[PDB]
Enzyme design. Structure first.
Site, PDB file in Angstrom:
ATOM      1  CG  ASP A   8      -2.140  -0.901   0.955  1.00  0.00           C
ATOM      2  OD1 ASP A   8      -2.644  -0.926  -0.124  1.00  0.00           O
ATOM      3  OD2 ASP A   8      -2.408  -1.943   1.908  1.00  0.00           O
TER       4      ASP A   8
ATOM      5  CE1 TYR B  49      -8.219  -5.845   3.411  1.00  0.00           C
ATOM      6  CE2 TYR B  49      -9.496  -5.102   5.146  1.00  0.00           C
ATOM      7  CZ  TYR B  49      -8.706  -6.102   4.596  1.00  0.00           C
ATOM      8  OH  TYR B  49      -8.988  -7.423   5.019  1.00  0.00           O
TER       9      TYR B  49
HETATM   10 CU   LIG Z   1      -7.378  -8.134   6.997  1.00  0.00          CU
END
Ligand SMILES: [Cu+2]
Ligand SMILES: [Cu+2]
Ligand code: NA
Ligand code: NA
Ligand code: NA
Ligand code: NA
EC number: 1.4.3.21
Lengths: 620, 620
Positions: free
Chosen positions: A290, A374
């Site tokens: 990320d 996320y």
């Molecule tokens: Cu997770």
């Protein structure tokens, strides 16, 4: 005034001008990264030179460039052409995410795969994911994203509830060509919705919660000078923001009497990787870096008062550059506030008759990022007693798949037909240490058990041992919870009043490190994640545990290359790299939106002070 | 109304009457323990019988007695004479603490030892400490306390700063005889004071702290019915208080839709031991069983509003009995309040356009105890998402000694000449589980690494294994942080909507367990502390991991004896015993009063619910 000040929109605008006049920012150029460089070591001359690092992409397929410019002078300091097959591709561009869904909508193989499933192509969202490096020789030197499909039943539907398994496509986003479409078979698309704001799912909302009111009638105890310099309760530091790393903490120091004593020169989360443990070919390539591939700072949220940050909140709005070099403000992107933190110290003494209670508090610096499904909160805490703590908060929607009939050893079932592949979330904290100055060393401290016998006749003794790490080749360490292993960063030239070197003790959570087979592609590209602690000698260009260009990089760069130098680290300018992470076996309770789970680490003083540093805290 | 109600002063007064009329409470009797008994299994008949357990001491040296009485009926249910050399001495009496300093002040050996150090006997405080079982044959069957000396320079002086090392005495507190005085040599009494309220030590108090105001303008969200029954945010439980264990949580349940679903029948800290790791004969016998030998509930503090508990606070004042059976109220001894706890769930979805944030909160139930120099806070937390957490907070003044010239492998130096011996603080949580009812089982869950090869061609897969513990003989487990080991308590007869057994996952901190040599006296008396997890089949009389009479007990009682029965625990009425602790190498920053350090554990739902249980939380 300060060289550690946040980047300004005017600075961004000047960089764009400098690059444009130099001919480096034509209509085919995109800025994939733009960031200020820290002052080099020896900043005791006020050589006020604001320098920026730029990564420039070329949408016609010409070679990209790394470029350093001086805003202070108006000059290009250097520009180097990158051979991306050698050193890695540039980070993913936000404008590239959508091109994958658009390209696939016109490809005959994709449409045929969707038609076999009776899916309306207008209803199919493609998650664009980083490609990694695997068996495909045609991808070397090319800019590849892979795509997995989810059905959105209507504009407000949560697509994550409807994964289309058995299907993946690879997309060259420079040449705009679908290289491969892999259809391993039809799985039923899970039919239940996951719309956590739909009243048929939530039921009636609770009316039982009474408000909690947190206010500061005289304002906060901290002050903010020159944009980003914080003084709070003897702490002093500068809060930076980088589009790759997010919040960076600079010049962490503590005022002990009349002296400002340095502790940490620079603190940051320098990489984070999310590896998936599902061996299905549809997902066995899935690993997000990320920080390195997507840049977590550029997807930072705007934090809402009373909702994301509660209490007397002071905001910073950092400025980044868009793909064309225009300044973009992340409004209310960083929250800062102090929080009550319970009891600090307490004693009721029978013999003296004195009853003593003091309360603790902490300073909080935080931001939130969203990458697709996320959402991650990054929190730094400073405590009255000298403790420094980092906490990552993981939430959002779990990544989904079909749940295969007959079950799975690598996927959890969340809903009928709906699975969640196993995965980890692994962070690297880079701590450029400065305990009372730059001459530091690291000791590994283990508990030592002692055998009953002479000198220990009753079998009650126990002790501890400390081992100095002297060279980088021996500075790659694993956790050992059973022996209470910690690491102490000390200054051998700065003693406390008992003539012991001053120090700080790092306490890890001792969670599992990278689980993949050591011969896997991900173990090579995320080698930092295989060990809990690394120590390197400081160097200007050793910024990230995975190197500068993580996207589609064959691996080995970063920390394994740095420590090969085998440099002296015994009383030297050193950097500690701490790996820590969550291993996520998804539960039913994580669906349809996941409650926060946390992981982190903390550093506590270890003979840094001559006695408790909170004796002067008043009695409330 | 409820059988789990707190003991009342009237109940205490009736017990005293019952014992007195029966002739069990003459002028030589002291009550060393008095506590209500929980309803026996099968309480589905409302057989309202409040029964109390009493331990009665005899100050003339006659045999003590265990006595059970019925307050409901006014009867003595049973009275048994104890042979204390066999089953152990009764807990220490508060009135016995002072007799040691008084007795030693007239003993010629003690006075001669003090005269050699030029110490005024009027200025010498003796810490009265539990004796344990070691080499002395004359102590078996006798009530022994050992004493270590500290100098108090003036009435408000902190004696802990001035230990008198090389000197210990043993005292028979029934016969009032000093059995032994051991003087191993003169150490300099450390001269610096440790008076943390003295302005010459604190310096000027900070004026920088601005107030934080936490208020609830509509009152708290929880309700308290019938003295001690709490409903909060779907949770339901009863808060008990026992003079030995302190706060006990009963009938922990969660309202899921229309059903009240049990989770934990009874939760308590059932023992806590503080073993010292200094091999000097002056202290190598030192081990406090704070719960079992001293009773932590009877030294609970009165908690001050705005200081110990901050916000909208609801107090309970539990009642205990004194040594003569008089009711004694611990005013404001338990604090309960709810606290904001940051973000609960958050997601910003690109495809749907929905931005979603919810805040978390927790319910806090807490009390504080002071045993001599140490002060411990016990905190239980319930979270919106079904998580249950326990946290111990350790503070107060560290126990001190001389620091020997030339250093020590088992003692830290805090100040010139002043040491702090190494030690641990180890807790046992006893969790009488009731996950959706009493048919429960425990599985140990380890991460499983997989080798690259067929079926795992890219080397990314990882999995997990679960092992059912079927019999007590196999239910003695160790932590393994490296493999992410956790334990799941499930109900094999209660399935969620995916047809998986409902469960809760216990997450440990994986701190070191008891460090002493396995052949030591303390390893035998604190055998629970050598292993992280024990599971027993429920039994009425198996209450404490160390047995009923810990004081001067030769060891082996409690858990090692229970599990020898090798009972079925696979889908049965079971109790989980979790060992967790702090290993304390004292630092300079711990002196002269120690900042709070913490240790604990938590339990999280694992397929207990059919989806996230906090979908109905409103949006602030
Ligand atoms: Cu997770
Ligand atoms: Cu301690
Ligand atoms: Na390469
Ligand atoms: Na450094
Ligand atoms: Na015995
Ligand atoms: Na049970």
């Amino acid at each position: 005034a300060s060289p550690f000040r946040l980047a300004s929109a005017g600075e961004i605008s000047e960089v764009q001008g400098i690059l444009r006049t130099a001919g480096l920012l034509g209509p085919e150029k995109r800025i994939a990264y733009l960031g200020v460089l820290d002052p080099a070591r020896g900043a005791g001359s006020e050589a006020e030179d604001r320098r920026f690092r730029v990564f420039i992409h070329d949408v016609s397929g010409a070679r990209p460039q790394e470029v350093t410019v001086s805003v202070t002078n108006g000059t290009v300091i250097s520009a180097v052409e990158l051979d991306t097959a050698a050193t890695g591709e540039l980070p993913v561009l936000e404008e590239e995410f959508e091109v994958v869904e658009q390209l696939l909508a016109t490809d005959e193989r994709w449409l045929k795969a969707l038609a076999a499933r009776n899916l309306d192509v207008s209803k199919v969202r493609v998650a664009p994911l980083s490609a990694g490096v695997f068996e495909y020789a045609e991808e070397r030197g090319r800019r590849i994203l892979r795509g997995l499909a989810f059905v959105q039943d209507f504009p407000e539907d949560s697509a994550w509830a409807h994964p289309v398994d058995g299907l993946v496509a690879y997309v060259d986003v420079v040449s705009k060509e679908v290289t491969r479409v892999i259809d391993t078979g039809v799985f039923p698309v899970p039919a239940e919705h996951g719309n956590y704001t739909d009243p048929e799912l939530t039921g009636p909302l609770r009316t039982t919660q009474k408000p909690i009111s947190i206010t500061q009638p005289e304002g906060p105890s901290f002050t903010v000078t020159g944009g980003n310099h914080i003084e709070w309760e003897k702490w002093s530091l500068d809060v930076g923001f980088d589009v790759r790393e997010g919040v960076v903490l600079h010049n962490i120091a503590f005022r002990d009497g009349d002296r400002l004593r340095p502790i940490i020169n620079r603190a940051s989360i320098a990489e984070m990787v999310v590896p998936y443990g599902d061996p299905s070919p549809i997902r066995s390539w899935q690993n997000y870096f990320d920080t390195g591939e997507y840049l977590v700072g550029q997807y930072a949220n705007s934090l809402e008062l009373g909702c994301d940050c509660l209490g007397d909140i002071t905001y910073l709005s950092p400025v980044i550059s868009d793909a064309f070099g225009n300044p973009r403000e992340i409004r209310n992107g960083i929250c800062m506030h102090e929080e009550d933190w319970g009891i600090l110290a307490k004693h009721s003494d029978l013999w003296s008759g004195i009853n003593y209670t003091r309360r603790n508090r902490r300073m909080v610096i935080s931001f939130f990022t969203t990458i697709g499904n996320y959402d991650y909160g990054f929190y730094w805490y400073l405590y009255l007693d000298g403790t420094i703590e980092f906490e990552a908060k993981a939430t959002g929607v779990v990544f989904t798949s079909a749940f295969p009939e007959g079950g799975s050893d690598n996927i959890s079932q969340l809903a009928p037909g709906l699975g969640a592949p196993f995965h980890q979330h692994i962070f690297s904290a880079r701590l450029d240490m400065a305990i009372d100055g730059f001459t530091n060393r690291v000791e590994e401290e283990d508990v030592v058990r002692q055998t009953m016998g002479p000198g220990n006749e009753r079998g009650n003794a126990f002790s501890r041992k400390r081992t100095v790490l002297t060279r980088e080749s021996e500075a790659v360490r694993e956790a050992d919870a059973r022996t209470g292993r910690t690491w102490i960063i000390s200054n051998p030239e700065s003693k406390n009043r008992l003539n012991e070197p001053v120090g700080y003790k790092l306490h890890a959570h001792n969670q599992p490190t990278l689980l993949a087979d050591p011969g896997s592609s991900i173990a090579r590209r995320a080698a930092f994640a295989t060990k809990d602690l690394w120590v390197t000698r400081y160097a200007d260009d050793e910024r990230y545990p995975t190197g500068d260009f993580v996207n589609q990089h064959s691996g080995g760069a970063g920390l394994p290359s740095y420590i090969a130098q085998d440099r002296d680290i015994d009383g030297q300018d050193i950097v500690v790299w701490h790996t820590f992470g969550l291993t996520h076996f998804p539960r039913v309770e994580d669906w349809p939106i996941m409650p926060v789970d946390t992981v982190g680490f903390k550093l506590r003083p270890e003979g840094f002070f001559d006695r408790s540093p909170v004796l002067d805290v008043p009695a409330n």
